[PDB]
Symmetry: D3
Subunit: 180 residues, 6 copies
């Protein structure tokens, strides 16, 4: 990585590249039954070849054009999962954050730390005013993230998700620049 984001001496964020195709792909299979509650939706497989030629390239192109960041999470130099800034709406000065992490790395404080830099990035660099995270109401290591950083529940989206044939509610949390 020429351009990189050091979160701490253990956590690193960087934009994927095509050569990241294999690990991501494999890294999404090793956890292929679960990873849908964390608003992504890999109930039906990654491909590696698809990631190499289309998804990652599209992701970079998007970073190039400035609508968001689809990035990889790194712990001791290995892809553990991904973090993301999306639904960027400059006029309204806001974006949302998503993320997910391989089970093995659950519990080391990765996502929470990665979100913090990403939050700092969002408020100081993009001069955004609001950042939101959402998570399936249902159970959450994921809701736990906005709650240690200090977001506020603001609402629910009834049937906001459609994972594995099932309808779930989505709960919204938001954090304002002045509160941060």
């Amino acid at each position: 990585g020429m351009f990189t984001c050091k979160v701490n001496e253990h956590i690193t964020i960087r934009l994927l590249e095509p050569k990241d195709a294999e690990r991501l792909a494999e890294l999404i299979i090793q956890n292929q039954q679960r990873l849908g509650k964390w608003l992504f939706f890999a109930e039906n497989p990654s491909s590696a070849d698809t990631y190499r030629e289309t998804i990652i390239p599209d992701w970079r192109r998007q970073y190039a054009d400035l609508n968001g960041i689809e990035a990889g999470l790194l712990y001791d130099g290995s892809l553990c999962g991904m973090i993301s800034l999306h639904n960027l709406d400059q006029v309204n000065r806001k974006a949302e954050i998503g993320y997910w992490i391989a089970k093995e790395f659950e519990g080391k404080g990765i996502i929470t730390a990665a979100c913090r830099k990403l939050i700092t990035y969002a408020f100081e660099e993009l001069e955004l005013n609001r950042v939101a995270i959402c998570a399936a109401v249902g159970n959450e290591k994921s809701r736990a993230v906005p709650e240690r950083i200090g977001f506020l529940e603001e609402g629910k989206a009834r049937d906001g998700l459609y994972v594995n044939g099932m309808h779930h509610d989505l709960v919204y949390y938001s954090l304002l620049k002045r509160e941060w």
Copy 2:
């Protein structure tokens, strides 16, 4: 229009076209300092050359409809289905109408047709409407129709300099 959507008499819905440009801009200037609370917000050339055509390509590519409203054959506003998300089987609906035509019950009837389309044609499960918190006129729409208030986005809107909260309403395909 070859292709059109009759809501009832007086009220027809249709994609815009380059030639709608001079009037769309006129209609937007006479209302400039309002559409924003209505979640929208101009050089009538830009619409002809860039914005109307983009809205059209976007409809051709199937993600959303940005359409014009017509009262008795004239453009009096817009209605719109955006944030289409086929994976979560949900979308959202926005709208705005020129003062001139307020109170004749257009938006409501227009949304009713749009929701129908969302629900039996795109087979969406969820439809939301979103309104700045202080604008009773828009909120009145989800409310007569039967949506349920779902939450707020703190600081959701940035209208001419200030912060305002947005409030969401939703309708499920089964409550319909």
Copy 3:
């Protein structure tokens, strides 16, 4: 469809959609023959991802309309306004329909609507219909509507290894 053209209680003309891909291909195969005599060109895939997407985009950009014909609700064929030439204020109209439905006077009634569009909305001065010099059922159409024969295109067609001539018919605004 949000946006249709209702010809008349049986017949609606409407844009095609990717999801028409499966029926559209079943309907061309069961008619792989007969169809180049009505001057028309693969898989439910190529239609789903490439052909219809471009027709729609063409419509969004304003050159012509490649629409489906719908009898009592389902696709029975397609009607077309092509070679739009604005400067010269003219265009052509082609069309085809599945055998299943050849008796219902669909093509003619659709054509009649599209003609109205060409002259009243597109403000065109001229519309032409073209046909294989030997397709009596095609030739009938312009003729019944009142088009004049203008001439022939020598070898204008190449249908399966062989070539056949094309006959032109035209209709001027001040006649319709």
Copy 4:
């Protein structure tokens, strides 16, 4: 011009470049309307728009292989355009059009350039049919197809809008088994 079409010691045909802009805008205005009849079209556009849009678009079209929009060069310089359009591959046919300045009339330029274009059409493209149409009252173009061996096919009623009005178009086709 690296790649070129030598009609004869006198006439050459070749793609235009952006640098040809100045002299195409200029050669056309020298002659405001004498053009919509010649089936171009008026309100003559500038050198910039020819240099940055029209000529590049013509070249890309040639690269993709549908049609030629080429400049006509009479002994060194730009005296007109000839072109191959409505190239219909499934029906194996195209249409040829052209125009030259009032200054180059008489020298058989169009006729000569057409021939090569046609020859290309029939054995390279392997097209079956080549057509030319022209305004009924525009003997100058008409003499061309009649000179080469095309047959009058029909007239399109009101097929042209030169300036303000409408005139009819007369058609001429030339099949392959036939030249």
Copy 5:
């Protein structure tokens, strides 16, 4: 072809066309790699007809470079290109290769010369450069016959089947004309 560059009575240069795709693929397969040294180093008719040839054409339409075929007695014996065009710096490079079957007939030299006049007279560049693997006699000789001067070496400029070789560079200045 409508548009053609006539080098001489036996040699013509022209843009390739999709239909040229089967012949280029074969011409390359039966030569193969002894062309990696030329500066070419595979893929099919299919890839040539639907991607490589079109990009080539499109780049000719855009006025950046020429990728053309060499024709000996109406037939494709190889290619020549004007690449790395740099209009601001008034310079370009020229490359080529022909099939063995057609070696020794003076084709490459002949087309280079034509290509050169054009680089100098019509595009009005000041500089023209050519390069070649340090040990590719056949290729190095063209520039020297024409009167290009060796300008320098690019260390490890080539990569031919896992080995790296040096590139030697020759330039020719307009006034040296």
Copy 6:
């Protein structure tokens, strides 16, 4: 910037963004009657709109597409120049480096320091074999950069540069990944 390259405590490298256009354009008008010896010619120089709408966006896509870097040099926070890796030839495993700096920032070793990070990346990530740098023959300050890091002079380009009306020679320099 989220993703950057910390060269050292004062010098950072980053992809430029549309909002850097005003500063880039001004820096370019400010110099420019050099900037030719430096091998970066606008010729018909900047225009803050053009860099914002076209030039900076394309550079960003190139970075996404993975074929080069057009980055900004920041001293203590702000643009003082650009570094660049271009002519990326993955097949021959080689590429070239360019860079320019504003006069007021001359002589602090920004370029050298930044080229080393760039090289590192070139040799240990794109895994290139060769890296070159070229410069105007009489551009002592530029020439100094390669020679200080230990490249070797490889040859000359006769009239390779064309500055303000006239021609000058380009001299080439190259570093082979096995000399590191």
